[PDB]
Amino acid sequence: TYSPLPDDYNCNVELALTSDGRTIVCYHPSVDIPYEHTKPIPREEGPMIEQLSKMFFTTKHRWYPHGRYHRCRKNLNPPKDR
Amino acid sequence: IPGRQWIGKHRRPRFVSLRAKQNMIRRLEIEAENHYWLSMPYMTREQERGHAAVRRREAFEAIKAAATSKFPPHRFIADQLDHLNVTKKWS
Amino acid sequence: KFTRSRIPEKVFQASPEDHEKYGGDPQNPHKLHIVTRIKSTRRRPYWEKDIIKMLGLEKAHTPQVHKNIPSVNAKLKVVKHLIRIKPLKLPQGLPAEENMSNTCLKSTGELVVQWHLKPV
Amino acid sequence: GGQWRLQQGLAANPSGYGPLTELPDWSYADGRPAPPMKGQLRRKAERETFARRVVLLSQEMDAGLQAWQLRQQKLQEEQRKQENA
Amino acid sequence: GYVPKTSLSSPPWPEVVLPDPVEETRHHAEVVKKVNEMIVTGQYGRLFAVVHFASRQWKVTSEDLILIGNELDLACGERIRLEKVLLVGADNFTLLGKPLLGKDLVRVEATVIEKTESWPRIIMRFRKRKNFKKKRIVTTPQTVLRINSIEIAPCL
Amino acid sequence: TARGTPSRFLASVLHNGLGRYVQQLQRLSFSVSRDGASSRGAREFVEREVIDFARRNPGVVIYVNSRPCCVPRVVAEYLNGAVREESIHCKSVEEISTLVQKLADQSGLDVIRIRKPFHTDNPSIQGQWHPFTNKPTTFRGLRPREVQ
Amino acid sequence: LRNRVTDRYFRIQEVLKHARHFRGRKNRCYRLAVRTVIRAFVKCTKARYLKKKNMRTLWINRITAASQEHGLKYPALIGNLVKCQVELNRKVLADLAIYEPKTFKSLAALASRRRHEGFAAALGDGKEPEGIFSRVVQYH
Numbered sequence: 001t002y003s004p005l006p007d008d009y010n011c012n013v014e015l016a017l018t019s020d021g022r023t024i025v026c027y028h029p030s031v032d033i034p035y036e037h038t039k040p041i042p043r044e045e046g047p048m049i050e051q052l053s054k055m056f057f058t059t060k061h062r063w064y065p066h067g068r069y070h071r072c073r074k075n076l077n078p079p080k081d082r
Numbered sequence: 083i084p085g086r087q088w089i090g091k092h093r094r095p096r097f098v099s100l101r102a103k104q105n106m107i108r109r110l111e112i113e114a115e116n117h118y119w120l121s122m123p124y125m126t127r128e129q130e131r132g133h134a135a136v137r138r139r140e141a142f143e144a145i146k147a148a149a150t151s152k153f154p155p156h157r158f159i160a161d162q163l164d165h166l167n168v169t170k171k172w173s
Numbered sequence: 174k175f176t177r178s179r180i181p182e183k184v185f186q187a188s189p190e191d192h193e194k195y196g197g198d199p200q201n202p203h204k205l206h207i208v209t210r211i212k213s214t215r216r217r218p219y220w221e222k223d224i225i226k227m228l229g230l231e232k233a234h235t236p237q238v239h240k241n242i243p244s245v246n247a248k249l250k251v252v253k254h255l256i257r258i259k260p261l262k263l264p265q266g267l268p269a270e271e272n273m274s275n276t277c278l279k280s281t282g283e284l285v286v287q288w289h290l291k292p293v
Numbered sequence: 294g295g296q297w298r299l300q301q302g303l304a305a306n307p308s309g310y311g312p313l314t315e316l317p318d319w320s321y322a323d324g325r326p327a328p329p330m331k332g333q334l335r336r337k338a339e340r341e342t343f344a345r346r347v348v349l350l351s352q353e354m355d356a357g358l359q360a361w362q363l364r365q366q367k368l369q370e371e372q373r374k375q376e377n378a
Numbered sequence: 379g380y381v382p383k384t385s386l387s388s389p390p391w392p393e394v395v396l397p398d399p400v401e402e403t404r405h406h407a408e409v410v411k412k413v414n415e416m417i418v419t420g421q422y423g424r425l426f427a428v429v430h431f432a433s434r435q436w437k438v439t440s441e442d443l444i445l446i447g448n449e450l451d452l453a454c455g456e457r458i459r460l461e462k463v464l465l466v467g468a469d470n471f472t473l474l475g476k477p478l479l480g481k482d483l484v485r486v487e488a489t490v491i492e493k494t495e496s497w498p499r500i501i502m503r504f505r506k507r508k509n510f511k512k513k514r515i516v517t518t519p520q521t522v523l524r525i526n527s528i529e530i531a532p533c534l
Numbered sequence: 535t536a537r538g539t540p541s542r543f544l545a546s547v548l549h550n551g552l553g554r555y556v557q558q559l560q561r562l563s564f565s566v567s568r569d570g571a572s573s574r575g576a577r578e579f580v581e582r583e584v585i586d587f588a589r590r591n592p593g594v595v596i597y598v599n600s601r602p603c604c605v606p607r608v609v610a611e612y613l614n615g616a617v618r619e620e621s622i623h624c625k626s627v628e629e630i631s632t633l634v635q636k637l638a639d640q641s642g643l644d645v646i647r648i649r650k651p652f653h654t655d656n657p658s659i660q661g662q663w664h665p666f667t668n669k670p671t672t673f674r675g676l677r678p679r680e681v682q
Numbered sequence: 683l684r685n686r687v688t689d690r691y692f693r694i695q696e697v698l699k700h701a702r703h704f705r706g707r708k709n710r711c712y713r714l715a716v717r718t719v720i721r722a723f724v725k726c727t728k729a730r731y732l733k734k735k736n737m738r739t740l741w742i743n744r745i746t747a748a749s750q751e752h753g754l755k756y757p758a759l760i761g762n763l764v765k766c767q768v769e770l771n772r773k774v775l776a777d778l779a780i781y782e783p784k785t786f787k788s789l790a791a792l793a794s795r796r797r798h799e800g801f802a803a804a805l806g807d808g809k810e811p812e813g814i815f816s817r818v819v820q821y822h
């Protein structure tokens with residue numbers, strides 16, 4: 001009845017040692033979301049920058065543009081990964 | 083503060099936190115164990131006398147002999163003739 | 174004047190409370206010291222820097238074996254605030270030429286002359 | 294957490310002596326062990342010269358005490374053998 | 379030695395009751411048996427190993443790459459068994475050893491691809507008003523390793 | 535520096551280690567002057583070592599040109615079209631064996647900065663973190679201050 | 683002038699190629715570019731120590747955050763993973779905290795289990811049987 005963590009949200013953690021006592025076998029199956037825990041699917045520059053700032057909850061400054069020196073230092077073909 | 087915080091007549095105050103007290107304490111404990119182990123020599127001062135005079139004498143014979151064996155290196159014919167290959171050609 | 178400092182002999186006479194605190198024996202003491210420089214010799218006088226060079230303690234946190242004799246102990250009493258002194262204990266014997274390479278000094282202070290890398 | 298490791302007889306730094314830094318880092322897939330690490334070679338040279346110093350100092354200590362004891366027995370015999378004539 | 383239940387009477391953390399060691403070692407026998415069944419039956423998907431290769435601890439899957447900062451005196455293409463693995467996980471179990479795993483338990487394989495140098499690396503020293511300006515340019519050696527497989531062995 | 539130089543991610547050519555290992559170096563092109571002290575150690579490399587090198591890896595084809603050059607070069611060309619031209623001007627035979635073996639060992643990727651020391655393409659196996667891992671659900675999916 | 687310098691364009695271009703992205707006349711004029719290029723190289727070498735430092739404090743922030751998700755704090759997690767002889771470092775634990783959170787949850791349960799064995803161990807002083815995860819593996 002002891003649980004080191006409240007195994008209720010991510011995975012059911014079951015700690016173990018081997019009988020030789022050298023490795024820590026951890027067993028953790030994924031916890032499914034229960035069906036009862038779910039909802040059914042429902043069926044001008046000033047004003048524009050206040051409207052975008054109010055829309056995306058950010059300040060006004062990242063909507064005013066930046067000049068040619070900053071548009072032409074941007075690496076337009078950046079390296080992709082993964 | 084009157085001038086230059088940390089030197090002078092009117093210096094700003096600095097106070098000893100719990101970090102600095104625990105640091106000074108554990109330094110004092112390491113020190114007191116050094117005071118324990120220096121309290122019991124394996125020999126008296128009479129008994130140690132001359133026990134390593136031979137090895138110290140041979141060690142300074144090695145340092146003295148390394149000092150008195152310093153001289154210009156050997157000069158060879160194969161190095162000087164070996165310079166001549168800077169104009170080695172093919173044919 | 175800040176001069177060199179002498180230390181009286183009652184400072185280096187252990188008590189049975191100290192003999193019970195640290196695991197030493199006054200009868201049959203230990204032969205070899207492990208010394209470890211754990212405090213920089215900068216902001217220290219030149220004689221202490223010299224003694225630290227004479228003991229081979231120029232690198233910090235590197236153990237060095239010395240003798241437990243009053244001359245070596247006199248140099249260690251000069252720089253006792255800069256070092257750490259532990260006895261070299263030897264559970265197994267001092268190593269022979271067969272076991273010469275397969276040694277390792279542990280952090281406890283013991284020189285284990287058969288040093289596998291395997292668990293018990 | 295190095296004070297715990299000092300309490301357990303381990304190295305205070307886990308990169309010190311022990312199984313993480315003294316086993317070989319890699320082997321061939323055939324099973325051939327690798328040539329040894331450069332730091333393991335230098336390190337075993339350090340432990341070997343350290344052990345040589347332990348043996349050398351221990352032998353100077355024992356030869357020093359025995360030489361003192363032979364000097365004291367010769368002083369006692371130079372005390373006893375002049376008690377006559 | 380009774381104290382009435384005030385605020386500072388009992389500690390603010392709950393009192394945890396650790397299980398009895400006999401029943402808990404039996405529980406470890408059950409869990410090690412189940413995870414051994416998942417390794418035998420091949421239930422696991424793809425693995426990852428944390429391996430302590432020379433310099434640090436590299437988290438590693440199969441089919442990936444590691445850039446090391448030294449030449450390992452190996453040919454390009456030679457297979458390597460990386461020992462000193464010290465964590466092996468799948469989707470539903472892990473295996474962390476104290477501190478390393480058994481060589482009979484985890485086998486991590488990796489080839490050498492390329493033995494490059496680094497990009498040239500400038501080491502400049504400069505002290506003001508003392509005419510102290512030094513420039514060095516250093517390229518370290520590097521090898522890249524393609525971890526080919528993490529195979530796991532039912533030995534628990 | 536690193537902000538003036540471009541950077542890239544640590545990759546290989548065509549998954550160079552997975553199935554088999556392919557030597558990434560196609561052609562070497564030595565140009566070595568017959569008479570000239572610049573290409574002396576190049577000549578001694580052709581007389582001694584370029585044949586044993588040419589046999590130790592047969593996937594490389596080697597073109598020694600032997601023209602009156604004034605600075606000798608070696609031109610490594612790689613499978614991905616990369617061409618690295620390095621000079622063997624006034625270098626000894628051992629230094630050309632380490633230089634040519636260095637060009638043989640590496641690949642046709644740029645020697646610009648590599649950002650990460652590793653490249654997984656499947657980094658997450660148990661599923662990547664999103665903010666709804668480690669959060670328990672509630673009954674009927676209810677949010678705080680919701681009655682029904 | 684008997685021998686005056688011919689190769690001087692290339693020395694100017696040795697310095698100025700590192701200045702090609704600067705602002706002002708630092709990208710153009712050699713007198714200004716030498717100071718800003720020297721200075722950029724000094725920052726470039728002193729920032730390797732700061733790269734290592736800032737990566738490590740970034741990892742301690744990530745391990746701190748993801749251990750606050752499991753109720754632990756950072757020092758309990760690290761000290762009690764040390765005390766299990768599970769000597770994973772900060773980089774690996776941040777990468778498990780991001781990419782493999784079941785493993786990080788099981789490391790959190792192992793570390794908190796060992797923390798409670800330390801509490802119950804130091805609670806019942808004297809001779810008592812040791813914890814199960816509190817055992818140490820002796821090497822020799």
Ligand SMILES: [Mg+2]
Nearest residue numbers: 084085086087
């Ligand atoms: Mg002031």
